[PDB]
Amino acid sequence: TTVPGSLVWELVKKNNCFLIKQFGNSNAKVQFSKEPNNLYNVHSYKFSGLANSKTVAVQPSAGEDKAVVLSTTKTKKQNTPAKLQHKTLMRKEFRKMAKSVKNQVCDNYYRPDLTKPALARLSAVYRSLQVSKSGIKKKNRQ
């Protein structure tokens, strides 16, 4: 974003390639945003992955077991897309993943907004990989 974050939001709050909107524009409207670096994929300015300098992504890696990528945008390198995101491939267990995410998101005051949400997505991604490894042992309905 050469232009500021608020302006990018006012530019893309109504249409962009990563926005999946269904059920019309009535009270039934359902809105998600499917860019890689949006955590809840909720299309709001808090979570928007395009209108922000400081964004974090938590994704399962390519085909390989139990490797999670945590990426944070580099604020200063921002007009350089090839060197725009600091990606971090970590493969340790969950408690040491959570400490490192807190290190990279909340503890350095990078963006404490998304302290809890980034960790929640980390839990979801981790257990997704865990069940891709083991299988459906639990119906997860109680």
Partner 1 sequence: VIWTESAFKKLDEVYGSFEASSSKKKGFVLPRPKMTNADLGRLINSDEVQ
Partner 2 sequence: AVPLLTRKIVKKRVKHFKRAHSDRYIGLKQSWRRPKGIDSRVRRKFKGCTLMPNIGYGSDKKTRHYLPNKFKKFVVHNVSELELLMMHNRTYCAEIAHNVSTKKRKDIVERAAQLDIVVTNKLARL
Partner 3 sequence: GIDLVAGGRNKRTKRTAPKSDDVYLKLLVKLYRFLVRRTKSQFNAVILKRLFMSKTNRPPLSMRRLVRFMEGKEDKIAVIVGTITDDQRVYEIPAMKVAALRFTETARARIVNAGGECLTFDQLALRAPLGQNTLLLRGPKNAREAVRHFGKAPGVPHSHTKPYVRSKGRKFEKARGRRNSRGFKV
Residues that bind RNA in the complex, under the rule CB under 7 A: 14-17, 19-28, 138-142
Assess 30 for contact with partner 2 (CB under 8 A).
yes
Which of residues 75 and 132 has its CB atom nearest to partner 2 in the complex? 132
Task: Choose the contact partner of 2 out of partner 1, partner 2, partner 3, none; CB within 5 to 8 A by kind.
Answer: none
Which of residues 7 and 124 has its CB atom nearest to partner 1 in the complex? 7
- Interface positions, 5-64, toward partner 1 (CB under 8 A): 5-7
Q: What is the C-alpha to C-alpha distance for residues 131 and 115, in angstroms, rounded to an integer?
A: 25
Assess 131 for contact with partner 2 (CB under 8 A).
yes
Q: What are the φ/ψ torsions at residue 86 (nearest 5 degrees)?
A: -85, 105
Task: Choose the contact partner of 41 out of partner 3, partner 2, RNA, none; CB within 5 to 8 A by kind.
Answer: partner 2
Number of residues that bind partner 1 (CB under 8 A): 5
Task: Choose the contact partner of 25 out of partner 3, partner 2, RNA, none; CB within 5 to 8 A by kind.
Answer: RNA
Helical axes 94-105 vs 115-134, angle rounded to 10°: 150
Contact (Cβ atoms closer than 8 angstroms) between residue 122 and residue 60? no
Q: Among residues 69, 105, 125, 126, which is the contact residue for partner 2, using CB under 8 A?
A: 125
